[model samples]
Target chain A: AQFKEGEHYQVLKTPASSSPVVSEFFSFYCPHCNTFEPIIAQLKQQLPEGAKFQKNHVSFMGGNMGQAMSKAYATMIALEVEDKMVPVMFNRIHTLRKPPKDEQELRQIFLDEGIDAAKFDAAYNGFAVDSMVRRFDKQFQDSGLTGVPAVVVNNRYLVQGQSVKSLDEYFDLVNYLLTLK
Target chain B: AQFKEGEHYQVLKTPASSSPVVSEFFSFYCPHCNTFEPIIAQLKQQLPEGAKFQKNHVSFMGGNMGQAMSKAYATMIALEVEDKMVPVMFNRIHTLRKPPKDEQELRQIFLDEGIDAAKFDAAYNGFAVDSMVRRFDKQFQDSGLTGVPAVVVNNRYLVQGQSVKSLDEYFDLVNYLLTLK
Candidate 1:
């Protein structure tokens, strides 16, 4: 009824499902994100069948580091090797001191993490990665953020913060909103 | 001269920063964040000596997970161990599927990653984490953002719908804003 007073149906008028949608904004360089990974993974299981989860990179530009990171993510997704990614990434950055910038280093990291040698090579070096990078570039540029680790729920209730108490709690806040129906 | 009309600037005068304070809305679940982590690390090395990187988390409920993650960050800041954090976190989320709900898991993950167990315990259990979490919650409420990964540069530019490109484009945008002066 209140939305009738407004010019937008910004939030889809569903019967506010027992399920909640968890949207996250992130960038690769953020250590906080790196650390928070496990919690989200854990929360996935406990969430009711109503809950849904997804992650997207806020690619605000196409030509720089942010773009590169977004592209790198696309490549990783294509590889379907998330398990190797986190451990290998941590070892490269925090453990190894200054991650490799060159293609060889990235490739080596993938190889080290046990990604299929040929597939990793093609995806990491191919146009698909670049394509996603470009798409994300415009997407991020359009949204307008200064950093990483932001979130939105059901696209209606947006929360741009992290360091949540727990994945469940993070979802709890969103789920709490579901009760409004 | 015009900040797109009624953008809400603290200063009547056009300042060096723009109307929106560019905040990189990010989260742990995002792979783009994990990828961009290295690039930002590299930039810090070349950033101006006086340049400061202010990392903020958007806490909606201000719960235990928030405290654990933020406190770990605080410890890294205090002990100068940030480099290790990003990878460790990414590893937990994207790799092991282990989520840090609170002190115990947060501590265990850090310890498993070979961080000082004592420091991890103290930081995870510390009061400062709560302080940080509460502060973030207030900010979340104040921003009135339905979701994040949105940048509010100077608390004016309420940019939403993030992709990684948006974050990397920030410095360039900042440079452009500088020209406004």
Candidate 2:
């Protein structure tokens, strides 16, 4: 595994040999991660064929106060509502400065965003959500990473930051890596 | 100003340029910055003759730690011995796992690196460090960044992480900035 940026990382096995894999790790509570959301979303969409992409939510680093918030994101993912909840959660925390809570306001945001509150509430406190959070931690650690907004390429190389200021370099690197025997 | 990657942004006369002038606000005490030394060194070597490069140290990022080490580096630069000190400092800290200190071991490393003990002692302890530190804060505040290893190309684009895994792509981004009118 390549560790340069030492941020986020994960190993992913793909069924397709030619497929490049991307495993991105981030914490929902990180304002920087929140900043990258739209950019990451667009990159995910533009990712080429034969590229498998995955995302995991790490529960915070340095035992910071944001672990619960990180875990909350996992719960959203487990509930199959991450697609809806991620931006809402980011917007709430970063833009609106709201601490993500099991509060009425949070529920309101969920309702407004079309998430099934009953489903999310149950999953947030459930075994799957907890396990997902734990798994994210393990995967992140296994990547030999140190911080957030990390991306792993083909489960063997890691890049730091969200979308990157160098998609041009990234693509070339990907192409170069792809050609290796 | 070229927004695309692989461009050389116009280096503007104004502090904030018409082209991106990437400022790397770094402190000498940063191990990560030390790690970046070789990468950036290589980057410096690879720059086309027409390219512009600037490395500005930020003092506030380190506080006391920043002051001591940066003064050491700046003194060397002013004395025309910076080239000798960089590798010496890097090897002592990174390869040997020597911790940074104002005390014995740090001094020993400098001495072993063949630094003039009298000169180093004088520069490391002086009052001018405070002034330099303040300037770093000022530069960093206006640097279009909140983090180190932050690359603000020309004056528009920004990137972080001490180094990039994809230098070719990184340069491609540089070249893109250069050609843009």
Candidate 3:
């Protein structure tokens, strides 16, 4: 009851996901998302057992670098290295302030992380990764969200982060919404 | 050495504060600022002696409501009820999601908070509050900051929140910059 419609969250025009899912639309270039990373990790762990947590990286910020980061995220998923790479990429761009200028530079980051170059290349250039990147772009565009770091519940509700008082309340709201029709 | 000029902070083209000060440019409508309130309270308490902290409410978001909220912030300062009213006002707009449409509606929020009607009238209608509003707008305009929840140290260096890994690191970066000329 505390989380009211139109105030705490918006009903997206996009169709709901076929399954119970929590998808976060974010970009690595977004400082707020970087700040939000720890909380995101918390949400991932706290989610209901049957609920699927998704990280949909948007390709709207940092221009070419933004698109590159989306591909990088897809590659991370392809190689099962998201847990290792998310913070690394965030630190590289924000803390280190040395964002990769091109794809090769991004590849080197994986290499430095000890991800095998051939394995990294296979995923980065693979069709599945390409489809993942395209799906990410389409999801963001279809959701009608104007910014990164958005949480879409079952693909229908966009959680209004600004409406909650604290992180606990934010999580409560999300959990409450997960029970919705 | 931990706080690099370009990475951790940026020197604003705007002239530095004539005195030692840390100014936060924010808007009541900004949810990030609302979320940041507790950290801000911590920062204020933790700031070194002789370092002044100023809260500058900017009038850029929410269109007409934005300007009115700026006036509301100025009124809060004039009434010396900032400690009580800042959160009240933030809750009114963000939590309640019923933003004031004009100056009159804004006044009612103060009245609801038990502020004396005559006193509220005097401050809301007085030239001092008007001057304060004008100054808030001018300060934000001069800072060249494109968004709210920005912290400027000595009015010269804008602390990059994205660069730091945690709130403690952010505070450290601000403290380190306070030692700069």
Candidate 4:
């Protein structure tokens, strides 16, 4: 899909933090982000060689829920369990309509995901994970985007779900943007 | 000041209960709705002769705060004190960020508004106010509108703040719609 600049996709004045990086700025609390999951999964599977998919979980604009989800995803990534836990987290929130409001509930989600109690707690509050959350938050602030799931291609072009009507067109724009620079 | 349909406002398929009726569907929990308050007051003051303004409070999607505000407004209407209480309720929720979540807090708001205890109690639970709340809820559902501070002109045209660039154009569109039917 050929998209018109300033109309379909917003131009990111600054280049992405890294090249060949397809970053997703998303939140579990957003219903649209939840629906975009499968499309993201497909994009992850189909991205060209040398392309890196960066999942940026952010919630700084509003609630603790986004921050908590960011921390949770960071912990899962550190533990190498994002592959197994992300889907469960999505289901728990969008399908089940239950989002964790506190640490206990979030911790419970980790335990249900088969992560050992102590290990999960340690990683959840780990310094590295906290740093990652801060990085994601700052990156999103710089992205100049308002809503999610927003895609930053090679850290240059920013695309939003509103820009495309279907999964095919979404990826088409992404694929086209890959050759931008 | 002419707004193109789909760009500035949506046309509601059905007319309001009567002509010259401009009904506003709003939620106290919505920030944009709070910002649109002044425009609403302006329209109320400047509406052409014989125009009736209807205020619809909705919470069907979720939240006890919206429901509480609905009932609070209903009580004020029944007590014939909506003029004094509506602005205060908006200030309490949007300005002070304190929305009543229960009966005690809501009733306290009534007392604070100088509504006599006995009269407030009787009208708060009166059948007329209850029916009005239910009617408002149903009208919102039938409005085919998804966001708050939505203005339905004569129950025919739906206007949202997101569709307009400024407060000036917003009421401009409203005044234009007033001349429609």
Candidate maximizing lDDT: 3
Deviation from native of the Cα of residue A135 in model 2, angstroms: 23
- Model 1 DockQ vs. reference: 0.02
Please write out the lDDT profile of model 2 over residues A1-181, one tens digit for every residue.
Answer: 3323343222332232355666778766555677777667766676777676778876532123345665667777676777767777777766786664554555566677776778767876788878877777677645545446776666556553333347655555444443332
Model 4, B19-113: lDDT tens digits are: 67888877666555767777788878877788888888875322335566688778877888977787887788767867676889889988986
> Judged by DockQ cut-offs, is candidate 3 incorrect, acceptable, medium or high?
incorrect
Q: What share of the true interface contacts does each candidate keep?
A: 0.00, 0.00, 0.00, 0.00
lDDT of 2 by residue, B1-181 (tens): 3242333332322344664344566655445677677767776676666667766675433324545565666566555676787777767655775657555655676677777888767766656645654555555544324335555656554543223347776765655554444
DockQ ranking of the models: 4, 2, 3, 1
Model 2 chain B worst lDDT run, 10 consecutive residues: B4-13
Native-referenced DockQ of model 2: 0.03
Count of clashes, each model: 74, 27, 0, 1
CA-lDDT, candidates in order: 0.52, 0.58, 0.84, 0.74
For residues A81-105, could you state the per-residue lDDT of candidate 1 as single tens digits? Answer: 7667855665566456565565566
Cα RMSDs, all models: 23.2, 10.1, 12.1, 11.2
User: Per-residue alpha-carbon lDDT of model 4 for A1-181, expressed as tens digits?
Assistant: 3677877776775765546778988776655577778888999888888888999887532244556878988998889998889888888876897878687998899898689988888889899899999888777655544446678887868775475777788778888777776
**Residue B131 error, candidate 3, Å:** 39
Q: Which stretches of candidate 4 lie over 4 Å from their true place?
A: A160-166, B1-181
Estimate the lDDT of model 2: 0.58
Task: Find the 10 residues in a row with the least total lDDT in model 1 chain B.
Answer: B7-16
